[PDB]
Amino acid sequence: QQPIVTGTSVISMKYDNGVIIAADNLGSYGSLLRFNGVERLIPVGDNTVVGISGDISDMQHIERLLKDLVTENAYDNPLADAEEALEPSYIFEYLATVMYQRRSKMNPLWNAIIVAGVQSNGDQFLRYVNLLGVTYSSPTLATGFGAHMANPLLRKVVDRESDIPKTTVQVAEEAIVNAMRVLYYRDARSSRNFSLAIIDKNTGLTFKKNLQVENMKWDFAKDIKGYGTQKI
Amino acid sequence: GTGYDLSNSVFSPDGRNFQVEYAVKAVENGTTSIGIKCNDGVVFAVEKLITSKLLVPQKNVKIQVVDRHIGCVYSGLIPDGRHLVNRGREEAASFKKLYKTPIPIPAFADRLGQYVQAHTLYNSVRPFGVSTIFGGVDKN
Ligand SMILES: [Cl-]
Ligand SMILES: [Mg+2]
Ligand SMILES: [Mg+2]
């Protein structure tokens, strides 16, 4: 196959108590910025948020897989909202497994996926999987342009593992929000509106919809004349 | 003649399917279980005989869920009940996958009914040894 309606970067990072993840609300269609109400952050329970870029139809598929997973985890499970609720690490292994089986049948799910969440024991979970089955974990994870522009900025806050306990939700969220602006400056397939999620071992799942890039700097554009010799 | 109650899909000369009626006997020997319909829902309740103080209390659950809106309880051969419920879960998934809306309660009844009726059609299977009470809230 070959992708059609698509969504761009998904960026994320770990901090002292949880993880943050964000992605803009756009479904592009080739170069037509066709759909604008598109949520690409899928919460699963109260402790996992799965962010998805790639083919939007396959994303709509992966969503229903996740709703089905929740529904069935409940079957004959009197602890499905406690000791036996779905863990982020379970939800990632499932998706990772599906992704690689699908590559291997030569019929991929045309996606990159980031699973962010908090484990039952408090540990932060943050791992990536894509249409080829490749998986990796780092203190920062991004897809699409975000790997090229977001990662260099976020890696400057949490460069090493030891930086994670030094980073606070406030620092981290600001990094994330600044990155979304960089991506809006320089990614021709991005949108000003975006969604952002925080998963904290203490405050739980905060899911912020309908953000906008603010505080852009454009004023210097008035002083840009021509392309070399032109003076006016 | 005689003989009409040893295979399943067999009509007796007075028009009955004795093997189904014998299945009811297993149901009747089961625990008592009920359903009450109210102004905006349903309640299900069941009796769990404490065979022995050795059973962990609260811990041999009998009421099963189907999808997120349907409750099922049954009397008789418990393992048959789980089977029927499993089928119900599949049948509720198929319906939602194609139609998106979660399966309406009467539509679910006929899914179960049609399947259970199916096991009175052939002498290569026996009838379900459970009577089942189930229900839920749907678009109306
Ligand atoms: Cl599978
Ligand atoms: Mg196209
Ligand atoms: Mg939205």
Coordinates of C-alpha atoms in Angstrom, one line a residue, chain A residues 13-21 157-158 163-177 196-204 206 208:
Chain A
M13 CA 9.5 13.7 26.6
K14 CA 10.0 12.3 30.1
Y15 CA 10.2 14.5 33.2
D16 CA 10.6 13.9 36.9
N17 CA 7.1 12.5 37.6
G18 CA 5.5 11.6 34.2
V19 CA 5.6 12.2 30.5
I20 CA 4.2 14.8 28.0
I21 CA 3.1 14.1 24.5
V157 CA 16.5 19.8 28.6
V158 CA 16.8 16.0 29.2
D163 CA 18.5 14.8 33.8
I164 CA 15.0 13.3 34.0
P165 CA 14.6 13.6 37.8
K166 CA 15.9 17.3 37.5
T167 CA 13.2 18.2 35.0
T168 CA 9.8 19.5 36.2
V169 CA 6.4 19.4 34.5
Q170 CA 6.8 23.2 34.1
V171 CA 10.1 23.1 32.3
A172 CA 9.1 20.1 30.2
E173 CA 5.7 21.4 29.1
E174 CA 7.3 24.7 28.0
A175 CA 9.9 22.8 25.9
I176 CA 7.1 20.8 24.3
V177 CA 5.0 23.9 23.6
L196 CA -1.2 18.0 24.5
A197 CA -1.3 15.4 27.2
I198 CA 0.4 15.0 30.6
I199 CA 0.6 11.7 32.5
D200 CA 1.8 12.2 36.1
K201 CA 2.3 9.6 38.7
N202 CA 0.5 12.0 41.2
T203 CA -1.9 14.2 39.2
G204 CA -2.9 11.5 36.6
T206 CA -4.4 15.8 32.0
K208 CA -5.5 19.6 27.0

